[model samples]
Target chain A: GFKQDIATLRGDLRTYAQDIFLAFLNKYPDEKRNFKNYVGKSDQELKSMAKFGDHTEKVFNLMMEVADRATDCVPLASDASTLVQMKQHSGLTTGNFEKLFVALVEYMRASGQSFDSQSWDRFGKNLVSALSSAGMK
Target chain B: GFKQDIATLRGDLRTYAQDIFLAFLNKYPDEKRNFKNYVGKSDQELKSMAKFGDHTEKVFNLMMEVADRATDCVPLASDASTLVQMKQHSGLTTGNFEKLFVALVEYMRASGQSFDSQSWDRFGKNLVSALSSAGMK
Candidate 1:
């Protein structure tokens, strides 16, 4: 049932990508500093920018990959490289994953998408475990 | 993909129920003492008996419930009543859930059911966690 909901998320990615990014920023406004190009811009202006589109896609794509492989520890562990690139570029860290989970859940709920919270936790926990096992500090 | 494989298992429940019970017995032959009615019967004879069919259905039903609710911890935890019933009847303990998981996975592999092992672990761990949190020893 959770994956079915995630399938719905995947299908509407083109529409929700910006929405999810906005949701994340709404919850963690300080995270906005990570977007250098979006400095001094309003949410509306940020939405219209190509770099914002790129950033949102990157954010959503990482989550899509995490959801897709959350159950496969080895493959998910290997994804540390992708995470590393993001970490290097934007100061992403294991600490931020919990925040990401909260923002994503907020977006899903606000959009009226239903999911099993325990299932979401499983994916979140497994993602963190795999990344940690891969040497994420 | 995990749910897809479980859907396959669900479709073939009539056959797999018996097989899963046999697999559980094969792994934990000592547990056969719980089946007083089938004490002297061979595995084939056990397969042929109505009592065995009833018993297998009960076993499979519990698992199906666990799988269905694993993603919803509150609901799964609310299933304490069902686990308690089994415990009262068969002296089941939390330890046996782990053994059941191993047996179920072994049967799935033997029957060529493809699954993400990590996903299965998520289900197993959640099931055990729920039951334990409900005061299961």
Candidate 2:
């Protein structure tokens, strides 16, 4: 399940968050338009950097805060909801929520850590479910 | 006062941990002998590289766990205590605890974040209290 030792993994959550931010954008070229501020910088440019650090962590923490708070809410479905509102404050589109989680998982894996596909899916599935229940259309 | 907005700061916990690792070492150069594993690298080398990330996170989490569980025992100071047993696994000498806390605070400050000195010291004093109260010599 989800990297048997994710919490204990060597990747700092910040670095994981940073890597996921750029990695997700790179893998999905279209996302660059949505996150204009991050474009043009190499993945390395974003890591351990000044000015870039705060926003990246904010974006990363938002998704996590959503997941952490997800269980309290329940199931829902469709395209938009609280998850949408949360990221929007930072200029992130609603769809980016889904993309962010996937990218985060990929970011961890790419760094040499491994987790079960089933578990990884399960981890994000909960958040997706939470998004649905968050009452978005 | 530790920054009132610590969790919000840009320093990823891993970086925070890494910064403290080197920060702690730099403050006590002789302590370098104790942490021979980290001796040669430049400060930047340790930031995002291999072999370093894993241990740094582990070390950070240990103190957190200690802080988390400190309330449970209520009182007890000895080798068998959670605080003692926790460090045993990390090979972190008891003295390292004090150094680790100080390093962590400095790490936050050097990043442009500011906190009330009173609050910062109060925070550590509480931990120190917990430690002494835990019965560790």
Candidate 3:
């Protein structure tokens, strides 16, 4: 069920930014900055920068706007459905399910926005956190 | 004469860091971040990050050391020789050539030592200014 939810979320992200995703994929050719090989310093660098309140506010605002748009387009019930199915199938055991969901939500929020200094910082921190928490870092 | 000086500088750079330069060349097998395509933003982006900075400093220091060693070993006045030859053969006009050499000495002192944030900032600003002044930006 967790796998299914992840697959669904990945599908949604892929579908929503299909062209941009494809372009990035094509541009990079090799995914050196993937979940597997990322050394975690980049995220640490961003977090170090996040002590500034203005920086955090800028990032938070951008993230929230993207989250609002994503939910408006996809409907909140779809997320709720995925969560319910994950809990039911996994018996809510052996995983930080809530954290995972929060992470997914945060990721969707960050990636859906255009690049700016704040958005770039948020994307770096949130994505690194997600990958690390998933045991990929 | 300036073009010839630049060519000589390039040769000196290559000779000084032959091994380290070769290693870097091997490391990035297919993707050489060519100086020919040196646009300001992309140059800044490539070398700004800690990953780039750390390794670049290591390489640069090694290069400087090698250059110093070679200069001490030879004590050749080939540079002066070239200037005189160019003046006689090509009727080149030049002014404050040794001042140009002094400026290079200052640059080498800054770049070959530890990282200087102020120097890098100045370099970046000058680069952007140069690009803008050249009507290339």
Candidate 4:
């Protein structure tokens, strides 16, 4: 269900992004090089410690705006690839993209957030479908 | 009492900025010519509105951060002074400087939010004092 429970998601997004940053590298060692610059930043200082300076808030706020317009992006999905900055994703492969969502689901499960597999699977497929088309540059 | 409950203030800073932008040229009509480019915008569409594209959210977020850090700025508070660009503020006078805070407080009061003159004045004065001695370019 693409229910509008994003209110909690919005408030909790910084935590989610941080957990990904802190845990992603170790859990999936293969992706370590992607976020190597973030290696030394402690959790306390994680907000501003980013190649893009903790864009979790900005990016997720945008996601929320679109979501509110019934353009609920993660559910309906848009080709808003600008959601993913192109610089880091210049060579972004769909496989790696899928890996990212898998990590998000794994992180959510690990963090004890309420989530189900069906909607997440659909959202992941739509994400790649949108990325394959013309999108935010 | 510098109550420091910036939660509501931060949540609605865009509305505050819009009111400031909207009222600046009206209560002080001479300021109108300065914001001629902004005339076409209606208040309803003003949230993400910007002469600097998407920079409004970015700049306003910075303002919220600084204000939370007790470092509000008006860049001489002139009608002609573009707060977003951080330009000359040449010939900008202190009267308009005080006016901006007046507008901010008025907006807060009208919003049915908690605010008081004593803290706002101190903060406002401190803002100008810092800019007077040394501050952003």
Candidate 3's displacement at residue A39, Å, is: 20
Ranking by lDDT: 1, 2, 4, 3
Off by over 4 Å in 2: A1-58, A65-92, A99-137, B1-4, B9-11, B61-83, B87-92, B106-112, B128-137
Model number with the top lDDT: 1
Over A54-119, each residue of candidate 4 has an lDDT whose tens digit, in order, gives 454444444444344333335334434554445746766666657766776676566665765455
**Quality of candidate 3's docking, in CAPRI categories?**
incorrect
TM-score of 3: 0.18
The per-model DockQ list reads 0.01, 0.13, 0.01, 0.04
What tens digits encode model 1's per-residue C-alpha lDDT throughout B1-137?
A: 56555555544444567887788877997877766776777779887675575557556645655565655323366675578566454557777777777787777666654765566666766777777787777
Deviation from native of the Cα of residue B115 in model 4, angstroms: 25
Query: Please, what are the lDDT tens digits per residue for candidate 1 over residues A10-105?
Result: 444434667867777778878766666766878788866866765565456456555655553233555665675554544566666666667766
Ranking by DockQ: 2, 4, 1, 3
Q: Which stretches of candidate 3 lie over 4 Å from their true place?
A: A1-137, B1-33, B36-47, B71-103, B106-137
Each prediction's RMSD over C-alphas, in Å, is 16.7, 6.6, 21.8, 16.7
lDDT of residue B66 for candidate 4 = 47
